[PDB]
């Protein structure tokens, strides 16, 4: 048969091929050219401090044993041969649970060119960890990393490199953005050496710069707590004889601030420090509590009666102070 040539070529390739040994074992170092094609940067879990990424993680090394002279130059094959040959043991250093997909068959690419160059890509779902600092939450920006290197082979055994320019060796796809909270600002790669218990390893790093959006947070925590300060500020304009009404104002607005304080601290890590959102909740709660203390003070002095000097001074003092605080805050963080 005509196909018998192309199966006498492959059986010639995998004849005496010891796949437990890297190519050029006692002679040189296995230079592995690597690039990443991010088909979809998945959603970022703030509570778990991790992120999800779908990739077409590529590799390209050089094997002298896989050398052939056939009718075809490139020898595009299925994954079966990828289990029969030496492939690098690239694991993800900060990965937590990565899925090598296999629907409907195993999603792997293997291309042996004539000289002996290999190309071996795969579709992965790396759920990498991302250490996040949330002192300016929710106007914070993170550089979520992605570190990968060989597990067993040291720096004198397997080194890594980018196949293209390092600015163009991580290509995020155009339509791939499953991010709802963040937006992917840009790319950053680096190559370094890490020191461990067994030896030195060449580690490859991929930083993804994400800036958080506050639109949802404006709807959920900021503008409810801006209106709640204004809602308790209505009580300054009433009578001095409306004691049940103004207690309803004070109690309802303090309860609203309290439930927004509790409901603000959700879907979030239980961090020890106080975020930038907490220093808005605290000052808003201080304003509404000061309004309630002002009502208690004017009620203790209430005995026809006359308009209160405390109320008339508070009607000017409270909105200007709230505006100064809002201006200072929304320039401290937003325009940082």
């Amino acid at each position, epitope marked *: 048969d005509n196909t018998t040539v192309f199966t006498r070529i492959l059986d010639r390739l995998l004849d005496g091929y010891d796949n437990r040994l890297r190519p050029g074992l006692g002679e040189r170092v296995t230079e592995v050219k690597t690039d990443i094609f991010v088909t979809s940067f998945g959603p970022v879990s703030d509570h778990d401090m991790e992120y999800t990424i779908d990739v077409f993680f590529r590799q390209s090394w050089k094997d002298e044993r896989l050398k052939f002279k056939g009718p075809m130059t490139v020898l595009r094959l299925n994954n079966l041969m990828a289990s029969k040959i030496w492939t690098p043991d690239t694991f993800f250093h900060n990965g937590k649970k990565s899925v090598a997909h296999n629907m409907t068959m195993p999603n792997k690419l293997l291309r042996i060119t004539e*000289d002996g*160059t290999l190309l071996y890509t795969m579709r992965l779902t790396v759920r990498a960890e991302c250490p996040m600092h949330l002192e300016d939450f929710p106007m914070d920006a993170h550089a979520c990393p992605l570190k990968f290197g060989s597990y067993a082979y040291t720096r004198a055994e397997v*080194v890594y490199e*980018w196949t293209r*320019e*390092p*600015a163009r060796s991580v290509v995020v796809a155009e339509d791939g953005s499953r991010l709802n909270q963040y937006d992917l600002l840009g790319q*950053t*790669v680096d190559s370094g050496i890490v020191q461990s218990s067994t030896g030195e390893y060449v580690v490859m790093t991929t930083h993804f710069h994400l800036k958080r959006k506050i639109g949802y947070f404006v709807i959920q925590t900021y503008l409810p707590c801006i209106m709640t300060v204004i809602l308790s500020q209505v009580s300054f304009w009433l009578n001095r004889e409306s004691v049940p009404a103004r207690t309803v104002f004070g109690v309802t607005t303090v309860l609203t601030m309290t439930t927004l304080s509790i409901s603000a601290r959700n879907s979030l890590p239980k961090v020890a420090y106080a975020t930038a959102m907490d220093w808005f909740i605290a000052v808003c709660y201080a304003f509404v509590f000061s309004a309630l203390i002002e009502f208690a003070t004017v009620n203790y002095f209430t005995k026809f009666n006359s308009v209160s000097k405390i109320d008339r001074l508070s009607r000017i003092a409270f909105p200007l102070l709230f505006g100064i605080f809002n201006l200072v805050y929304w320039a401290t963080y937003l325009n940082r």
Partner: antibody, heavy 116, light 105 residues
Framework: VQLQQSGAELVKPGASVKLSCTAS????????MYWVKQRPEQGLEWIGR????????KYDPKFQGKATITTDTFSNTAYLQLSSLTSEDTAVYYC???????????WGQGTSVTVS | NIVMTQSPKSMSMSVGERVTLSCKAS??????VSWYQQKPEQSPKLLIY???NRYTGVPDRFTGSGSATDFTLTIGSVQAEDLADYHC????????FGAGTKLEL
């Protein structure tokens, strides 16, 4: 592990000059070939970059059109062309292979072109 | 692309003391710089790759330092055979170069 170039060239301005460098001891397909321009007593300026495996050449945004870089397969050699050379094109050229961590490891021997 | 503003253009000391080079990147280049020396009638030779990696055949006195943006090259106890120009390169993008730095006695 050696880069061998051609000799010097004496051409009139407005003409075209053919210049090339040959790499021996290693195949040029796995590495990247570079080109750099050294005008005398100033810094280095990069000309362009090829790769013989793929063939998509790419140049400096202030050097396209007037300068192109080509290569072949059998002779393991990288060629280039200049178009409409001027007085500021009088310089010495080197070609450099890609090393570890993209370092421009092994350079040429120097080809100085002069105009008249 | 990436603009390199290595300083100074020329600086001179005697034989046998510390000298510190500097190179500044316009944008982010992450530990991908390269230091070359320019001997007269000679092509550039690789000295330091990455950010701080001594190439084979480089003496121990040649030591570079690296960061995201600013890079320095330090030579301890320079002598007569190191009297050459020094160039700063990069490879995080398409490769560019600096101006250079002359050394004198």
């Amino acid at each position: 592990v050696q880069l061998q170039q051609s000799g010097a060239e004496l051409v009139k301005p407005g003409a075209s000059v053919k210049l090339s460098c040959t790499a021996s001891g290693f195949n040029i397909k796995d590495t990247y070939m570079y080109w750099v321009k050294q005008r005398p007593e100033q810094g280095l300026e990069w000309i362009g970059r090829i790769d013989p495996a793929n063939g998509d050449t790419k140049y400096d945004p202030k050097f396209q059109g007037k300068a192109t870089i080509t290569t072949d397969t059998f002779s393991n050699t990288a060629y280039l062309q200049l178009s409409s050379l001027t007085s500021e094109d009088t310089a010495v050229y080197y070609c450099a292979r890609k090393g570890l961590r993209w370092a421009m490891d092994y350079w040429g021997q120097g080809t100085s072109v002069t105009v008249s | 692309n990436i603009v390199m503003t290595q300083s100074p253009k020329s600086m001179s000391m005697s034989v046998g003391e510390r000298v510190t080079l500097s190179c500044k990147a316009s944008e982010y280049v992450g530990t991908y710089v390269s230091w070359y020396q320019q001997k007269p009638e000679q092509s550039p030779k690789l000295l330091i790759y990455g950010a701080s990696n001594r190439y084979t055949g480089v003496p121990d006195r040649f030591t570079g330092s690296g960061s995201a943006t600013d890079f320095t090259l330090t030579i301890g106890s320079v002598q007569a055979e190191d009297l050459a120009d020094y160039h700063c390169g990069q490879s995080y993008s398409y490769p560019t170069f600096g101006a250079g730095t002359k050394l004198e006695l």
